Amino acid sequence: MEELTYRLFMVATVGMLAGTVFLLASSREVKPEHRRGVYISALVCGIAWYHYQKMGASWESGSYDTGLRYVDWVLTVPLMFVEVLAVTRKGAAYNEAVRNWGIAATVMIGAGYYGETSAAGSNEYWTGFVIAMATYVWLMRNLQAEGEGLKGDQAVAFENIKNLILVGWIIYPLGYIAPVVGDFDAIREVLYTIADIINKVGLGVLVLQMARVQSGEK
């Protein structure tokens, strides 16, 4: 498991860079008024690229620092909400949702960090999990409520964005509890890495697809 985990870190590192530069290269494919979300998606992948280089070296050393993962999450998760909420809101409604979801994400990630750095299976470990879970469900329920009146191609493209988050973010709580299901400390890191690739690169691709639709492309 240890060698597999290192290799996945190294592959994911190049994957995040590839997501970054692909998304930048693809920005010319959409109208200029819809390129902001593609650029923000590239920034998300670029921040992850930076932290993934650190995580792979950290894992390779044998003294791994999950703080690298959690600081990447605390920066990138609110950024991912910036473009999701732009589809459905502007002005005051947008500013309120971006702030409130970003606060919730920070609580979720901070609670997860508190629990993950505690003894596995301890009351502190479960406290972090439960607080993070409740905040996560609150975020998902808010996300499900967004864009209810949308129709047509834009509604389909937004539902694809929503479903990627609603399904793909489930991997994180699974990874967090992997160490208590078995001798699976490394499996937590495997699942987190797979999830980050799927969720970061995947959301960027779907945001690009959202921009094509908004550009009037078929």
Ligand X SMILES: CCCCCCCC/C=C\CCCCCCCC(=O)O
Ligand Y SMILES: CCCCCCCCCCCCCCCCCCCC
Which amino acid is located at 79 in the chain? L
What gap in Å lies between CA 37 and CA 64, rounded to an integer? 33
* Rounded least distance, CB 76 to ligand RET, Å: 4
185-214 footprint of ligand X as x/- string (CB under 6 A): -------------x----------------
140-199 residues near ligand RET, rule: CB under 6 A: 169, 172-173, 176, 196, 199
Residue 122 touches ligand X, criterion: CB under 6 A:
no
List Cα–Cα distances, 85 to 25, 58, 154, in angstroms: 24, 34, 14
Stretch in the footprint of ligand X (CB under 6 A) among 1-9, 46-54, 76-84, 89-97: 46-54
Stretch in the footprint of ligand X (CB under 6 A) among 84-92, 109-117, 138-146, 175-183: 109-117
Residue 208 touches ligand Y, criterion: CB under 6 A:
no
Which amino acid is located at 77 in the chain? V
Binding site for ligand Y (CB under 6 A): 74-75, 78-79, 82, 98, 102, 106, 164, 198, 202, 205-206
What does the binding site for ligand X look like in residue numbers (CB under 6 A)?
Answer: 20, 39, 42-43, 46-47, 49-50, 67, 70-71, 74, 106-107, 109-111, 113-114, 131, 160, 163-164, 167-168, 198
